[PDB]
Symmetry: C2
Subunit: 340 residues, 2 copies
């Protein structure tokens, strides 16, 4: 061990400088202590307690949960595979300060299977702490969570926005929202104020946008009648694709609101479920939570996560069940140790 | 020559031969001399001075066709003749409540005198409103006695009206679970018991019909309406609706009056009252929280800004919101506000 140390390939934008395979040491610019040893063509990250000329010091373990945590989607990560015992650590660098998406792609190559399956896998974070993973699958699952702004499965579950691939009209003529409601698809994608071009601009595939001809810009009576006489069912694949585009688009509005608040962290530093809770309430009540959910926003900007659970439990807005489910997401992050 | 001058009845909580003219100063007033003839109070006014008649009173600017007097005020209703700085009026109601006046003026024994003279209201502030006819004054009275206009409130443009048990939501929607069995103009029984309705003044016969509808919400209310709907008579449904509309109106009234603006809710014209209650009834009564832009304009008495505030709410209920704005605008146009 470490097994297959020069197998596979390494994703690195940094590629430093008679093709010689003597060991070369370098300090990776933006940081210390990040000494790298290049043997053959490959970067090797080593640590030891004992002070040295060419090894890094022992890195602190991150408090981030390996089973349920995420790293900020706005951060580059370093992925390493290797072995460690008694104050000596030797890791082949597999991804060196690469994006989450690049990493996910890079880690799924058959070339890297041998090395990733027969060594301990870890992520070295930008803050220079490390997350040690039980296995490569766990690491891969951590990255998958991390790259999403919200948890689209919770979002489209029945406890939240639900999911109906058939054109639906979620109001009735006795309802107060009758005239503002339009033809709806998937998880709350309402076409009442949207044209085909709007959807293309938002990156909806043409094959999907074409399908929705006749459902655009219809509201109230016309949307209601249209659904009753000529409905349309998308396939689950297309409806999820269309839903996620709008979920993510909406999420970025909540994100900017959060970020502009300057509370000492960014939206991407919050755990996935809590981001999902905040987006869920926004999607339903309007995104400017400072006005549409003052008691929630208060707890948020205060980073009072227990208080945030209390706030959700405490609003009666005719939608208290959905609010309790949102507070339950935050409470999960609390109980998991992701918040505080 | 007031036809039937000594006919009919006079409503007055204040008060052998009575065939002699007796004169008094109406107690808590000033320039309110009365003359009792044959047992009936006579309000006289003369231009050129006298010491048995009052000085001529100023005409109120309150609109006789669309205006109201505050339902918290007592009024004097007089019917008679006037010309050339000589006014002589038989008092029909002396400082009575609005409701008292409505009832009194609709008695058959007074029909004749009210039909054949000029009818007016002497207000508490001693200003007068002159009416083209008794029917007009009676309608003016009916507007004044109601805190909001129930017909507008219950019209399709506003809260609407459906005497049949209905469930104004569906399982998809946000509010499916908080919605209960509803009757008339938005009376929701989801958090109400038969006793609550009885406490609120609902008659037993109406309350009794609703037994299986109380306290149901969400799925249970939704199913109940589908499986066992009930249609109330229009009269019973209006009775029930009007109790809750009025109860809600008093909540808004209290908030308005607590703001110290300084006029009381009862001093606003009817249609503007209706507008404010209608938005409260639908969005939550705490308007400073549920509709701040509207509330902030109200308490600043910025009536034009009030219309704009209504016109610019985006809450997914734009149509109704603009109709409420339109009520306020009508009051501005009628010269009732500002
Ligand atoms: Mg309502």
């Amino acid at each position: 061990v470490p097994a297959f140390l020069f197998s596979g390939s390494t994703l690195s934008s940094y590629r430093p400088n008679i093709t010689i395979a003597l060991p070369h040491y370098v300090d990776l610019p933006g940081r210390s202590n990040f000494k790298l040893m290049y043997i053959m063509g490959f970067p090797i990250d080593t640590e030891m307690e004992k002070d040295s000329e060419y090894s890094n010091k022992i890195r602190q373990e991150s408090k981030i949960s390996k089973t349920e945590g995420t790293v900020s989607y706005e951060q580059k990560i370093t992925v390493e595979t290797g072995q460690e015992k008694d104050g000596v650590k030797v890791y082949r660098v597999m991804v060196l300060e690469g994006t989450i998406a690049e990493s996910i792609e890079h880690l799924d190559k058959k070339e890297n299977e041998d090395i990733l399956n027969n060594n301990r896998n870890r992520i070295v974070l930008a803050d220079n702490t490390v997350i040690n993973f039980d296995n490569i699958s766990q690491l891969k699952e951590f990255l998958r969570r991390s790259v999403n702004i919200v948890d689209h499965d919770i979002f489209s579950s029945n406890g939240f926005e639900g999911f109906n691939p058939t054109s639906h009209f979620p109001s009735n003529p006795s309802s107060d929202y009758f005239n503002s409601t339009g033809v709806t698809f998937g998880s709350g994608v309402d076409l009442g104020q949207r044209s085909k071009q709007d959807l293309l601009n938002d990156g909806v595939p043409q094959y999907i946008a074409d399908r929705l001809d006749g459902y655009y810009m219809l509201r109230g009576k016309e949307a209601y009648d249209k659904v009753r006489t000529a409905p349309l069912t998308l396939s689950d694949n297309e409806a999820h694709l269309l839903s996620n585009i709008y979920i993510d688009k909406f999420s970025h509005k909540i994100e900017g609101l959060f970020n502009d608040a300057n509370i000492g962290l960014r939206f991407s530093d919050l755990p996935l479920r809590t981001r999902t809770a905040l987006v869920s309430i926004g999607y339903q009540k309007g995104f400017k939570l400072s006005r549409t959910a003052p008691t929630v926003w208060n707890k948020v900007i205060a980073k009072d996560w227990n208080g945030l659970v209390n706030a959700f439990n405490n609003i009666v807005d005719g939608m208290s069940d959905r609010r309790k489910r949102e507070g339950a997401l935050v409470q999960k992050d609390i109980d998991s140790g992701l918040l505080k």
